[PDB]
Structure formats: C-alpha cells, structure tokens
Symmetry: C3
C-alpha cells in the first residue's frame, strides 16, 4: 500500500514529540490489520429501552445489596449471548483456507475498556450461562484490573464478539471496527428521549442507538438487519429470553 509522504511539520510552527506506549502500538497494528482484511459495513438501529430502564432502576436495591452496580452492559451482554446462539453465523470465524467458517459452540464476549495506556478488551466467558448480577460483578472486576494494568493475557482471549459502549460519553452513532478474527462488533451510543409514532400520536420513548459493524464476506446485508432487529426486540422486552 503506498505510504504517506513525511512532512517537516516544524516548518509551520512549534512541534513536540510524545511517544506511544507499546499498548498503543499493538492496538494500532491490529486495527490496521483488521481494516485491510475485513470489508466493513455498519448497520444502524434504535432500541426502545424505556421499560428496560425502569427495570434497571427498580433493581438498584438488589444490586446494591449484592455489591454490584447494574448498568446497561449486563443487559446488552445477556441479549447478545442469546442472539449469538439464535443466529450462529455471528458467533463464527472464517477458517484461514477462506473456504469454511468455524462455528464456535461457546459464547464468550469481550468489551472495550479505554485505559490511559491504551485500549484493552477483556473477555467474559460463557456469557450465556451467567446472570445479570453475575455479569455485572465480573464486568466491573475485569474493568478495574484493566485500568490497573493487572489484567493478564489469559483474559484477553478467544472472544466471539465485542460490545463497545460509548454511551456514557455521548454521541449519536459510530462505525466501530471489527476486531478480526471475530466477524461483528456492536457499538452502543447515548440514549435520548424520542418521539415515536404509536399509530395515532407521538409518544416519548427512551431510545438506545446501536451500530453493528460486520465482516461482509461472512455476514450479508439481510442477516445483519435481522440481528439488529431481533436485538432491538429483545431489549424492548427482555422477558423473551425466558421463552
């Protein structure tokens, strides 16, 4: 690929060189390796989380007793685990022969933690088997270890899918990058109150923005519109996971 020409930046004004941590360097290399290997498409969708929210907030007692804090990440993780099992091509990877997909029969999911040294993406194993408070507890442990450079490579491995949540900072949507060899990553941005047509008038409903990027060689356009559709349906009534 042609390089970018060097520029004497100091011709235009004062410059200063600060260097990158090896963590940044790693991160930089893996992203570019994904960018060039994966033909990327992003599917956007909004889910009605008005009831999910009200539930989150009512179980604040139970979660405080249990020592965890229930955010939207456990709810996101449980629903994606259920869907990674309904729609298995999302839970798979392209075999290196380019002629097969390796369907994984396990559901471990990673999630992005941005630490000062760089991006780390700790993996929770067997998301399909743990409960909302279990996942809430674990998510939090892994994140603190991640910030404290006390997370060990063991825990950064063999994930099937990634959730990257910027909802706590803001933004309307983004186009995340597939963390190859995985085939899809779900970006979650900030919830807003929004008018939604109820057949007769507009009701305010709390809407969560979802931005699913995928490896188009393995997932086609309709498979992906269907994944974000099912997920917005699950998040609107999480009781369907009981079914």
């Amino acid at each position: 690929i042609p390089p970018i020409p060097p520029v004497d930046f100091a011709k235009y004004g004062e410059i200063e060189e600060v260097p990158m941590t090896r963590l940044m360097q790693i991160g930089a290399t893996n992203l570019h390796r994904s960018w060039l290997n994966v033909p990327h498409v992003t599917q956007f969708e909004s889910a009605d989380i008005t009831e999910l929210e009200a539930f989150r907030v009512a179980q604040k007692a139970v979660a405080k007793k249990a020592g965890v804090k229930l955010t939207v990440l456990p709810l996101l993780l449980k629903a994606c685990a259920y869907l990674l099992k309904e729609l298995p091509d999302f839970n798979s990877s392209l075999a290196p022969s380019g002629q097969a997909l390796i369907r994984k029969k396990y559901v471990h999911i990673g999630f992005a933690v941005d630490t000062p040294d760089g991006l780390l993406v700790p993996v929770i194993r067997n998301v399909d088997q743990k409960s909302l408070l279990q996942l809430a507890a674990e998510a939090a442990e892994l994140a603190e270890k991640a910030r404290s450079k006390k997370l060990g490579a063991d825990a950064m491995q063999g994930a099937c899918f990634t959730i990257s949540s910027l909802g706590h900072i803001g933004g309307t949507a983004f186009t995340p990058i597939v963390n190859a060899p995985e085939v899809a990553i779900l970006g979650v941005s900030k919830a807003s109150m929004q008018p939604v047509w109820d057949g007769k008038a507009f009701q305010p409903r709390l809407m969560l923005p979802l931005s699913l990027s995928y490896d188009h060689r393995v997932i086609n356009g309709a498979a992906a519109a269907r994944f974000t559709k099912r997920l917005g349906d699950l998040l609107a009534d999480i009781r369907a996971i009981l079914l």
Copy 2:
C-alpha cells in the same frame, strides 16, 4: 496486506466447521477487491414518501389486475434512472488508465437479492425505458429465478448502479459497499413515521432512509449530497419525472 494470525479456536470450547458455497466465495472475493480499490464515503438522507405511499396503495387494484405487486423498488428504480441521466458522473466508470471516466449512455441497474446460496445481483436493462408495472413484473421474475438458481450469468452483467433494499427487514441506515467497477450503490432501509417541521409545528410524515455509498475518486462530496437531495425531491413528488 498483513494476514490475520490463525487461532486454535477449539482451545476455548467446541467448534464445528461448515463450509462456504462457491457463491459465498465469489462474493467474498469481490467485496474485498472493492473494499481495497474504492475509497468509500456514505451520504445519508431521508425522503418523505407519505404521498408515494398513498399512491402505491391506491394502484393496488391495477397492479393486481396486471398480475404484479407494486412495492417501492420500481419507484426507486425509475427515479434513480432519471437521475443517472441528469447527473451522468454517477452513471460512469473509471477507465483502467486511471486518467479517464467511461460515461455509459445506457441505464441498466442491478438490485441485491439475498438467496441461501449467497448474494446475487440481477440487472434490469434500460430502466429508463420501462414503466412502473414493467419494472415490477421484471424485478419479481429475476428475483424468483435468482432464488431458484435458475438465473444465468447473462443477467448479472453490465449494470451501472445498484439498489440494495433492506427496508423489508428493518434498520435505520447502513453503509453499503460499492460494487466496483460501478461508482455508487443506494442502500434503502425501513420507513418510519416522523415529526417534520412545517414552519409552525411538527407534522407526521412517512420517511424513507437512504444511504448512498460512492467511490470518492470519481464522485466528490457535493455531487453526492446533490444526488441524494434530488432523489429525496423526486420521491416526494414523482410527477417531476414527467417534466
């Protein structure tokens, strides 16, 4: 381009290998070839289809008599054909010398059909010359042949532009991939009722999401904002095609 390292996926749990149809393999190869050749930009726009819809639904009698079913795809195809003629750089391809564009004086348009064996994109020729019921009939023939593996390579050739409609499944917008050597592809997602400001109050209007990806080497940012603008104008009052 550096490869992705192989991972022994079975270290993390049970895996299973299912293989790809040659159709998937083809599809995979062409997408990646586009991804690396075309610097991609996506322009988003929403069109007011409230009147187009009401028309669609009133001609249901006529279409049933004629044996076709009138969906939004014939209306999309007619308007894009008209615009591919108004704005010709969208109807062209970059000559392989990299120093010229081959402007095509014909308008054949392909459309994406997702079949079980993979993605197929049958082409309707001379869209500019056929009527809404003609295109409705033809769209449907080609799609059934496509699902039935009875579509022949003849019919997958020399298109100028592509429409990829996921509207029937859902989603808010997506970033489709230019089907090189074409220079643009129009993605259409699900229509929603939306409040639209009428200078004094918000009216509910049925809004169709449009996501136009283009080859930025041939189309610049303003040419593309102008194409989606004209198209939202045409779809708001399709009678302008008579002009």
Copy 3:
C-alpha cells in the same frame, strides 16, 4: 491489492470517454492513499445551534458593514481551534517511525472547497488567533481564489485538521475521509428543526449534524465521543470560549 478486471462497457450500450483533470488525478491518488493507511471510524453527534443561529443573523448588520458575510464556517472554525487546543491528540500526526506522535503547537485548519477542476482544501493559519469576521473574510478570499485557479500551493499546506461542510447542499450525515497525515476531519451537513426533549415535552430546536471521522490508530473511541460532545456544547453556548 488485487485489481478490478476491465469490462468492455460498450458491450452493453453506447459509451463515451471523458478524461480527468490532473487535479482529479491527484485527488484520487491521495484519497486512496488515506483510505489504505488510516483505519477510519466516524462518530456522529448533533449540536443545538438555535441560539448560534439567532446570533449569526443579528450580526448581519456588522458583517455587512465589514464587507464579509458571516456563515457557520467561522463559528465552526473558532470552536474547533479552541478544542484542538483543549484536546491536543486531535491536533497531532503519527511520526513515520510509527512509535511517536508529533504534537503540533500551532492551529491551522483547512476547509474543503469543491471547484470544477476538482477538490481543493485551502488552509487558514492560526485560526486560534483570528476573530469571527477575520476568519469570515479570509475563508471567502481563499474560496474565490480556489475557484479561480489562482490559489497557490503555499496555501494548501501544513493544516492540522479539516472541516468539510455540505450543509449548503443537504444530507443528513456522511462519513468523510481523513486527509492523512492529519488525524481527524469534521463533516457538517444540513441543519433541521427537531423535537428535543426538555424533561417534560419536546421543544423544536435547530440541530446541526456533525460527522467526525478519525484515525483510530491515534484516537480511541472515547476521545472522539468526547470531542464531538465538547463541540456540540461549545456550539450550543459559544460564550464558553471566553472562559
């Protein structure tokens, strides 16, 4: 990277070859060089410009006296200059050793002008030091020289960031391409009146769409959600720049 196969386009109908200006050729080459070097992410956000607008329009007298026309571009430029100083990683470039960032202590910003010969991106130097009418005057000079092929290479150099505004043509959002070796570009599309929840009811507020693309090797997902957040905050009350 594999090439795209040549197609005898004339098998399908009449074609015509028109050639590209060297300006297009240049533009084409630089875009593709960016596309393959920069792993791109786009962050979307909307800013409430209702008060900024009303201000713009009240200073129409002053601007007419001063011979300039105050559009949104000076307001965009002043706020980005302030932020390129608050959040310095946006004002930097990746050193060619891949192991360092060159932080630039200057703020010159380029902006995209689409001329008939191709795209040109004149640079305003030391945006941080000039006032709204200064920048309004200058923006306009550079743009006319650009359209008149009277802009000289001097003026197309050593920018730190780019603003690409298609707001005057239309569109809802787009994904612009980082103009490498810069690390981010802000796309601005068309403002619309929109219902915004005020805790009790929806108020109409004039909303400006912002689409920030960045080089993910240098800027992480949260740094970028924070830049578009601060910018929507600055544009909502530009007096915070006085602080």
